[PDB]
Ligand binder design. Structure first.
Ligand SMILES: C[C@@H]1O[C@@H](O[C@@H]2[C@@H](O[C@H]3O[C@H](CO)[C@H](O)[C@H](O)[C@H]3O)[C@@H](O)[C@@H](CO)O[C@@H]2O)[C@@H](O)[C@H](O)[C@@H]1O
Ligand SMILES: C[C@@H]1O[C@@H](O[C@@H]2[C@@H](O[C@H]3O[C@H](CO)[C@H](O)[C@H](O)[C@H]3O)[C@@H](O)[C@@H](CO)O[C@@H]2O)[C@@H](O)[C@H](O)[C@@H]1O
Lengths: 315, 309
C-alpha cells in the first residue's frame, strides 16, 4: 500500500483551488450557518477529483468558448452571450456526470476579469495574422443567464462595441466586480449551473465536522475588487497543490481520517494538529473564528491514519 | 532517491513563464537568440534559479505600492510603483537574485490588471484598472525596487496603497512594442548588467535542438498570434523542488510515451540544468496524442545520441 503523503509546502508556497490567488492565511469560522459544499478544490485523499475540480491553476474560474451575439439585459453595461466548451477546447457534453464544465466558478457573485479574443480568420495584409481584442468583463454567476451546464453563459463589459461574434474567446478571472448587497457575493452559495429553478447535479458532497469541539479549517485568500468597499475572501478546503499531489499519488486511504501536524521546520515543534478527512478537508479543535496566526515557514505533515475515537489536542 | 517526473499530459500542464496552459510541444532549430529565460528555471535536483518561484499566481506578478503619477513618452497615464517580494516583505536588492522572484523575464508590453485594497478603513476602498508594463523601458527597474506601469484610466489610481499586478497577456506585438521572448529586461535599468542569472541553455550535441512547452498569450489588441515558450512547465519546477532527487549524471534520458499503446513516441535529453533537447531538424509543433507524457528512463552522458524524431 503506497504510503500517503502531503507536499512539503509552506503557506507562502500554496495557491487557492477556488480562485487564482495565493493562500494568505489559515482560517476558521465555527458558527458558519451555510452548508459548505464548494465544487472546486475537491479531491479525495486517494486522488479522485470531484465536483468541477480540475488540475490547472489557470483553469480555476476560467472559461473558454465563442461569443454568439450581443444580447439584451436590464443590468448596466453591454451584455454578450458566449457558448462555453471544455477548457481543453473540446465541446462540453452536458450528459457527462459533472455539475458543469471543469473550472466553472463555484460561488455566487460578480466575477471580474478580462475577456480576450484571437480571431480564427487571418488577414493577408497583416502577415496572415489574426486580429485580437481584450476588455474588462464581469460574469454574474447568480444570473439566470449563467447556464454553463447548458453550454453557455453571459458576461457584461464596459466596452460597448468591440467584442466580436463567432470568435474564440477566453475569460481570465481577476477578482470580484463588487461586494455590494446588489452584487450577491456569497462564497458558499452555488450557482444554478443549468439556470434558475433547476437542480444542480453530480455535486461533490457537503463537508462538516462530526466530532464535538471541531470546526472546518480553511485555506483563505483575499480576492481583488474592481471597486467599492470590502475585504472579500475565498476559502478553499485544500490548496490547488494538494489536489495536484493527491491526484498524482493516488495513495490508498487506510482509514477515514488522516492525522496531520502543522509543523515549524525551524524549531521542529508541532504548532497544532488537525484531522484530514477522506473526502478532502480539514477539521481542528478550535473554539473561535478568524485567522490562525502562525509562523510563515509552517506546513502540514502526515502523521498517521487514525480511527473514529481519536480526539484532537485543542489549538 | 530515484529521479521522477510527474505524470501529467500537456493538457494538465501550465507555463512557467506566463500564467497560461501548455498548448503544444515546440521546436525552432534556427532560433538565433540566446535562450536564457529566468522564470521556469530549476535544476533536476530541485534548485530554483533566476527569478523562479513556486506559485502559479506569482509568474509575471508584482506586489507593492504606487508612489506617484509620472510622465512618459509612451501612450497613456503612467504610475511609479515600488515593488516588494511577492510575500510582502521588503525586496533586498543585495540578495543573490536578478530581481524579485516572479518578475517578467522578457521584453514586451505586459498587459494585465492593477488592483488596490486600501490600508485605511470599517472596510477599505478598492479599485482596479487595466494596466501595461513595458519591461524594456528604462523605468522598468525591479532590481532597484521600483517599476512603472501605464493605464488607460487617467485618474483613479491611489498613491501609498497596496497594489497588485495580475498579468493577463500582451498589450501589442507591433514593432514599437518590442516583444521578444528571449530578450531579458535590464532589471536595474539601462547601462547596468543583469546579475545572478540562470545560465543560458543550448544543445551541446550536434543534430539537437531545444524542445519547448509552448503557450499562446492573449493580446489586448492588434494583429498577431504571440507565444511564450518555457523550458519546463510549472508543475515540473514544483515537482523537482519537492523531490530534490540527486542528479546521477548531466543528462536524464526521457521518453515521451503513449500510455494507451505503451509505445514511445520519441525520446529527449533532460539536462541537469533543467531543459530538454531532441534530435529534430525542423521547426513547429510536435504533433502528439493528447494522452502523452514524459517518463524518466535512465541517466546517460552528454555524448549519448538521441533517436531522431
Ligand atoms: C470606493 C470607490 O470604488 C470605486 O469607485 C466606484 C465607482 O467607479 C467609478 O468611478 C470611479 C471614480 O470615482 C472610477 O472612475 C471608476 O473607473 C468608475 O467606474 C462607481 O462604480 C461607484 C458606483 O456607485 O462605486 C464606487 O464609487 C473606485 O474607482 C474608487 O477609487 C473608490 O475606491
Ligand atoms: C486589430 C484591432 O485591434 C484592436 O484595435 C486597436 C485600436 O483600439 C481602439 O479601437 C478599437 C476599435 O477599433 C477599440 O475601440 C479599442 O478599445 C480602442 O483602443 C487602436 O489601439 C489601434 C491603434 O491605432 O490599434 C488597434 O487597431 C481591437 O480593439 C480591434 O477589435 C481589432 O482587433
Amino acid at each position: 500500500s503506497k504510503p500517503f503523503t502531503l507536499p512539503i509546502l509552506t503557506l507562502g508556497e500554496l495557491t487557492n483551488s477556488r480562485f487564482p490567488l495565493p493562500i494568505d492565511v489559515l482560517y476558521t469560522n465555527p458558527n458558519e450557518s451555510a452548508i459548505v459544499q464548494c465544487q472546486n478544490g475537491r479531491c479525495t485523499l486517494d486522488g479522485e477529483l470531484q465536483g468541477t475540480t480540475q488540475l490547472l491553476p489557470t483553469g480555476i474560474c476560467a472559461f473558454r468558448g465563442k461569443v454568439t451575439q450581443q444580447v439584451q439585459d436590464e443590468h448596466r453595461g453591454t451584455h454578450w452571450n458566449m457558448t462555453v466548451t471544455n477548457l481543453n477546447g473540446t465541446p462540453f457534453d452536458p450528459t457527462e456526470d459533472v455539475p458543469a464544465p471543469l473550472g466553472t466558478p463555484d460561488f455566487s457573485g460578480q466575477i471580474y476579469g478580462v475577456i480576450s479574443q484571437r480571431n480564427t480568420n487571418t488577414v493577408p495584409g497583416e502577415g496572415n495574422l489574426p486580429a485580437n481584442r481584450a476588455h474588462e468583463a464581469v460574469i454574474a454567476t447568480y444570473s439566470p443567464k449563467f447556464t454553463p451546464k447548458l453550454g453557455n453563459i453571459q458576461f457584461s463589459t464596459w466596452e460597448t462595441q468591440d467584442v466580436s461574434s463567432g470568435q474564440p474567446t477566453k475569460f481570465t478571472p481577476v477578482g470580484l466586480a463588487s461586494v455590494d448587497a446588489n452584487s450577491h457575493f456569497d462564497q458558499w452559495t452555488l450557482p444554478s449551473y443549468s439556470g434558475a429553478l433547476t437542480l444542480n447535479m453530480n455535486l461533490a458532497p457537503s463537508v462538516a465536522p462530526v466530532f464535538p469541539g471541531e470546526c472546518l479549517l480553511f485555506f483563505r485568500s483575499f480576492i481583488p475588487l474592481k471597486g467599492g468597499y470590502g475585504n472579500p475572501a475565498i476559502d478553499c478546503l485544500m490548496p490547488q497543490e494538494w489536489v495536484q499531489h493527491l491526484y498524482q499519488e493516488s495513495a490508498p486511504s487506510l482509514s477515514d481520517v488522516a492525522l496531520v501536524r502543522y509543523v515549524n521546520p525551524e524549531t521542529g515543534r508541532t504548532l497544532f494538529e488537525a484531522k484530514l478527512h477522506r473526502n478532502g478537508f480539514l477539521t481542528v479543535a478550535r473554539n473561535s473564528a478568524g485567522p490562525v496566526v502562525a509562523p510563515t515557514n509552517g506546513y502540514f505533515r502526515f502523521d498517521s491514519w487514525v480511527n473514529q475515537f481519536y480526539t484532537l489536542a485543542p489549538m
